[PDB]
Amino acid sequence: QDNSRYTHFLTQHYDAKPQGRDDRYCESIMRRRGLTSPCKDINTFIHGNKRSIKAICENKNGNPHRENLRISKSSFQVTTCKLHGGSPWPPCQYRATAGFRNVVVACENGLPVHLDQSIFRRP
Structure with missing residues (x-):
């Protein structure tokens, strides 16, 4: 909320560079961020x-x-x-x-506050 709305979206989404681009990385990060x-x-x-x-x-x-x-x-x-x-x-x-x-990041207030998983519905 209020500037942290964007980086709530970036807590969940933005992971600046992975360990690797694989299933062990994604199970690890989904565990730690906690989705x-x-x-x-x-x-x-x-x-x-x-x-x-x-x-x-x-x-x-x-x-x-x-x-x-x-x-x-x-x-x-x-x-x-x-x-x-x-x-x-x-x-x-x-x-x-x-x-x-x-990415199609949905922007409110000059901040991408959201991101559609419409593109990323079927990767």
Whole structure:
């Protein structure tokens, strides 16, 4: 809330660079950040520059996309960890599907406060 809304989104999403781009990394980070209780079905850990993340809401390094969504021009490394556990409750087996592509971070107030997992629905 109020500047920390963005980096609540970046607690969950922004993990500046992983251990590796694999399922042991994504089970580890989902455990430690704790979207593991209950298991989040799909969540992308974004990796890159934090300066780049904020600058997606700038018009220089991110285009406006309809109604306040901001599609990036500086594609980020994005490990889209999808749950292939089966259990909704912990433990959660996360299979990492690593890709590198542009995020649609939804921006309020000059801060990307959110990010659609609409792109990252089926990685």
